[PDB]
Amino acid sequence: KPEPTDEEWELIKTVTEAHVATNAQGSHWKQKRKFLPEDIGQAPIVNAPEGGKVDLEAFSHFTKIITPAITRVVDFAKKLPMFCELPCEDQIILLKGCCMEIMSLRAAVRYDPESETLTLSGEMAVTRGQLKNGGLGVVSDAIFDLGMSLSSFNLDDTEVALLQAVLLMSSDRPGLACVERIEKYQDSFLLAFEHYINYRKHHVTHFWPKLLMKVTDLRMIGACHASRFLHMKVECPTELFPPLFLEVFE
Numbered sequence: 001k002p003e004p005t006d007e008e009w010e011l012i013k014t015v016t017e018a019h020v021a022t023n024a025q026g027s028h029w030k031q032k033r034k035f036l037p038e039d040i041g042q043a044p045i046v047n048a049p050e051g052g053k054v055d056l057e058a059f060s061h062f063t064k065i066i067t068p069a070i071t072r073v074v075d076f077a078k079k080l081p082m083f084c085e086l087p088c089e090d091q092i093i094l095l096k097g098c099c100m101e102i103m104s105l106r107a108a109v110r111y112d113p114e115s116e117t118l119t120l121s122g123e124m125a126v127t128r129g130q131l132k133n134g135g136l137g138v139v140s141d142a143i144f145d146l147g148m149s150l151s152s153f154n155l156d157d158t159e160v161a162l163l164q165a166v167l168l169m170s171s172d173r174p175g176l177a178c179v180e181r182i183e184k185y186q187d188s189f190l191l192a193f194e195h196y197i198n199y200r201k202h203h204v205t206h207f208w209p210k211l212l213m214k215v216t217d218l219r220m221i222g223a224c225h226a227s228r229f230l231h232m233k234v235e236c237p238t239e240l241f242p243p244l245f246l247e248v249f250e
């Protein structure tokens with residue numbers, strides 16, 4: 001079980017700092033978080049079918065905080081030398097492809113079993129129902145279940161940062177030009193990640209294989225969100241969609 005090489009530590013230091021600098025965690029979330037009033041997302045008539053409707057008030061609060069979150073994903077990627085050297089067209093495709101995947105991971109690692117909330121951008125704590133009714137539908141359930149599941153992993157900033165890099169460098173996104181180059185970058189991240197894991201010595205058998213399953217869960221959330229986005233455009237007024245929100249998931 002090899003630990004990271006000297007070159008891998010350099011990479012690790014790079015991605016970790018990149019993540020830390022864009023994860024909005026200077027003044028830790030547990031203390032900074034405000035709980036979205038229970039009133040918001042609350043259905044007035046219990047017996048009216050939920051169907052695929054969207055709570056527009058909840059939706060409004062979410063699109064308000066989502067833009068600065070989207071920008072942090074971009075800044076994260078833009079702090080990686082490998083990414084920066086990719087053609088702009090590929091950069092765009094990779095960002096549109098992993099944006100939700102990374103934001104969902106960042107929210108999932110901030111799951112709180114006490115209140116049963118996910119803390120978004122380390123500032124707004126929301127419940128399963130709020131995020132569900134507010135527009136995500138079952139994707140909210142997926143993110144919360146993932147959050148619950150990660151709680152025992154004890155993932156540090158390096159491991160979260162590495163997961164983000166792996167998702168960022170996905171050569172299977174439709175339309176990519178530098179497929180080979182992107183895959184090579186992912187392999188380098190994957191390898192450095194596996195070695196960091198061995199170095200960490202987590203007390204759990206097959207931790208690496210299990211971590212990889214979480215990446216798969218995030219890929220599913222990402223794609224499922226693309227679908228839920230189309231529904232939002234149909235259920236919500238065009239005015240509640242910020243230009244950045246549209247540009248990234250268009």
Ligand SMILES: CC(C)c1cc(Oc2c(Br)cc(CCC(=O)O)cc2Br)ccc1O
Binds near residue numbers: 059
């Ligand atoms: C607008 C609709 C409901 C909507 C909501 C939505 O919820 C989130 C998540 Br899962 C994470 C973060 C940031 C986490 C962070 O970076 O700390 C912010 C937000 Br608003 C994601 C996509 C989407 O289309």
